[PDB]
Amino acid sequence: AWQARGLGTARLQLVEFSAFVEPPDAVDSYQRHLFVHISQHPPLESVDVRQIYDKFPEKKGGLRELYDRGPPHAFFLVKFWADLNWSGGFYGVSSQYESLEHMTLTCSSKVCSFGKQVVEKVETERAQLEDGRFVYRLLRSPMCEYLVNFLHKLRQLPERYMMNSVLENFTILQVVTNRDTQELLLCTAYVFEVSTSERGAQHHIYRLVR
Ligand SMILES: O=C(O)c1cccnc1Nc1cccc(OCCc2ccccc2)c1
């Protein structure tokens, strides 16, 4: 009855999320290539979280501990089929959330390889009042150089199944918390495959249950 139908909770809803590259010539005629993209402008299916425990960090800030803090309804798994056909351009990530209440968000994004945290980015965004609800805009964050280099290497692999093998061990954990109260608002686990290109980016969102 109170089961999510999109990625978010009654406190904080994902509006839009994308990762993209704009070619250097974008200044002349604009174009951006979307690696992955969620736009949220029946209940979702569910995946038991224990199955994905070892794809993410441990001991602290890991999935089990986070799920242990709660709240359980705030945990989502997103599977992406990334579009890897698109050098020297701008690699960016854009996130947008909204809420009924005014908070200061802290958003932590962790890239893990074989479950070991490899890179982490932490950002805060203060609410902006706008049309009844509050909007949080973390737009055009530069991709970190580890991911850009990873994408350039990945795009070079001679077989799609080889990119999928490599991506089997690559995950991203995103945890959004109330900066002031420390309460977790949204935790999203991302897992990745490569899209055949022809099909651009796709995704499938699941609730994480236990
Ligand atoms: O923004 C950053 O530097 C950043 C830093 C630390 C952690 N996470 C970050 N961002 C982020 C979050 C979620 C997805 C995403 O990229 C999808 C592209 C992609 C990557 C690999 C295989 C296929 C497709 C980027």
UniProtKB/Swiss-Prot annotation:
Annotated localization: Nucleus
Transcriptional activation: region residues: 1-210
Function description: Transcription factor which plays a key role in the Hippo signaling pathway, a pathway involved in organ size control and tumor suppression by restricting proliferation and promoting apoptosis. The core of this pathway is composed of a kinase cascade wherein MST1/MST2, in complex with its regulatory protein SAV1, phosphorylates and activates LATS1/2 in complex with its regulatory protein MOB1, which in turn phosphorylates and inactivates YAP1 oncoprotein and WWTR1/TAZ.
Record's subunit section: Interacts with YAP1 and WWTR1/TAZ.
Protein's UniProt name: Transcriptional enhancer factor TEF-4
Species annotation: Homo sapiens
Gene responsible for this protein: TEAD2
Included range, full protein: 217 to 446 of 447
